[PDB]
Amino acid sequence: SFVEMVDNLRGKSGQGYYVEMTVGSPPQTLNILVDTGSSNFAVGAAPHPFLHRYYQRQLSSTYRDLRKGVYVPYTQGKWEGELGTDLVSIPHGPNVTVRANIAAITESDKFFINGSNWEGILGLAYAEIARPDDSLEPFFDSLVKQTHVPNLFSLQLCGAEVLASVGGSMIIGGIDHSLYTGSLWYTPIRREWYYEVIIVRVEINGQDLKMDCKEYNYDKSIVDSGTTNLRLPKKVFEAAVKSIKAASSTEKFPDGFWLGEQLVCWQAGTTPWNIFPVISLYLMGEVTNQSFRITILPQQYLRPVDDCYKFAISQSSTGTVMGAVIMEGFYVVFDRARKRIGFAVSACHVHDEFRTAAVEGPFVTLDMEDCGYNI
Numbered sequence: 001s002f003v004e005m006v007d008n009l010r011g012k013s014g015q016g017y018y019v020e021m022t023v024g025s026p027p028q029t030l031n032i033l034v035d036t037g038s039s040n041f042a043v044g045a046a047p048h049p050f051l052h053r054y055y056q057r058q059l060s061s062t063y064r065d066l067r068k069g070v071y072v073p074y075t076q077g078k079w080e081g082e083l084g085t086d087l088v089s090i091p092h093g094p095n096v097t098v099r100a101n102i103a104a105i106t107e108s109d110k111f112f113i114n115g116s117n118w119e120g121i122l123g124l125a126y127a128e129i130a131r132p133d134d135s136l137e138p139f140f141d142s143l144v145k146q147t148h149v150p151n152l153f154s155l156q157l158c159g160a161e162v163l164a165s166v167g168g169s170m171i172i173g174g175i176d177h178s179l180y181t182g183s184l185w186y187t188p189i190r191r192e193w194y195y196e197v198i199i200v201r202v203e204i205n206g207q208d209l210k211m212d213c214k215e216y217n218y219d220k221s222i223v224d225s226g227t228t229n230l231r232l233p234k235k236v237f238e239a240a241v242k243s244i245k246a247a248s249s250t251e252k253f254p255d256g257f258w259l260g261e262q263l264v265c266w267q268a269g270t271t272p273w274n275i276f277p278v279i280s281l282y283l284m285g286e287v288t289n290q291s292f293r294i295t296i297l298p299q300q301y302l303r304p305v306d307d308c309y310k311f312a313i314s315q316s317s318t319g320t321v322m323g324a325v326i327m328e329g330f331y332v333v334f335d336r337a338r339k340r341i342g343f344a345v346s347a348c349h350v351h352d353e354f355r356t357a358a359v360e361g362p363f364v365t366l367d368m369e370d371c372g373y374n375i
């Protein structure tokens with residue numbers, strides 16, 4: 001948790017947060033998307049219309065070919081590449097250098113984003129979901145094994161012609177207490193593959209959705225910085241939108257808005273935040289029958305793009321995805337060492353004059369274990 005690591009993240013609204021890294025010898029500078037939703041470290045390694053620079057293996061004296069192909073299919077897009085290892089560093093991170101697996105991207109489809117300013121991706125999740133298989137050690141694992149950096153990292157993602165620039169901090173190896181206020185509440189990492197968690201209750205403006213909690217984790221729920229929106233299973237999504245619509249019934253918006261397709265704008269500075277309800281996600285606590293809640297404001301789920309916004313909540317077919325808009329305003333600790341994820345109100349916490357993002361506990365909830373999808 002270094003002062004030199006504060007504000008080491010940057011990006012554009014809806015295009016992901018990236019950190020600067022160097023690869024090879026001499027160091028080749030590249031901006032890398034911070035993704036807790038995957039486990040492969042990959043970098044563009046061949047010309048592409050959206051890439052202004054890329055990894056050139058031939059220029060690295062420390063590059064070693066692993067003579068193996070690799071391919072990763074995400075929800076959004078996919079890429080193909082060649083495996084190898086090389087020295088990697090994070091200029092505004094711990095002062096260490098490690099030899100890590102690197103997938104040199106040679107072919108991709110709908111992966112890179114025009115104007116995003118990043119050229120690669122850093123999968124921070126576990127080996128179990130790494131490709132080709134779990135034998136390909138993820139970056140963070142290599143970092144911990146090769147150095148004395150504690151097995152933990154934390155993310156403080158902050159909110160906001162071109163898209164609004166965003167900023168944040170990735171604290172590697174510790175917790176920086178100046179980045180949050182109040183107490184840190186922890187939910188268990190259910191299984192070490194994605195950063196899987198369990199949601200036991202969901203409220204919209206204090207009103208319980210009243211669903212069998214298995215629905216909230218229908219298939220699974222994960223914490224994913226590589227995805228912008230809060231993605232919800234069909235049944236949960238419909239209930240949530242229906243509730244939000246009713247709360248903001250004072251005004252009417254096109255279906256395109258609710259479908260997160262088209263945007264909605266208001267007279268500069270008049271966005272009626274008060275008509276939109278807060279959303280509370282109750283996460284399983286470290287103790288049976290005990291949970292805590294993180295409360296999200298509309299300033300979070302209505303993403304900036306007259307002031308224009310897009311509805312940052314959408315339907316998922318692969319489980320709940322607590323994306324960047326949910327993480328923004330909270331300090332999230334990925335405590336791998338104790339298999340838990342912590343939440344606390346961020347220093348760049350979620351706004352409002354009458355309301356505010358919060359992390360509150362405990363709340364007694366019986367049978368939280370039956371909320372998960374049992375393989």
Ligand SMILES: CCCN(CCC)C(=O)c1cc(C)cc(C(=O)N[C@@H](Cc2cc(F)cc(F)c2)[C@H](O)CNCc2cccc(I)c2)c1
Binds near residue numbers: 037072110112228
């Ligand atoms: C970066 C923010 C902007 N974008 C992208 C532009 C629309 C989003 O908000 C967005 C939206 C959707 C609907 C899906 C994804 C997505 O797939 N993200 C992965 C990282 C990533 C993929 C990529 F193709 C582009 C990109 F910018 C970011 C993430 O890992 C997925 N984790 C779950 C998982 C599933 C299967 C397999 C594995 I392994 C993991 C990102």
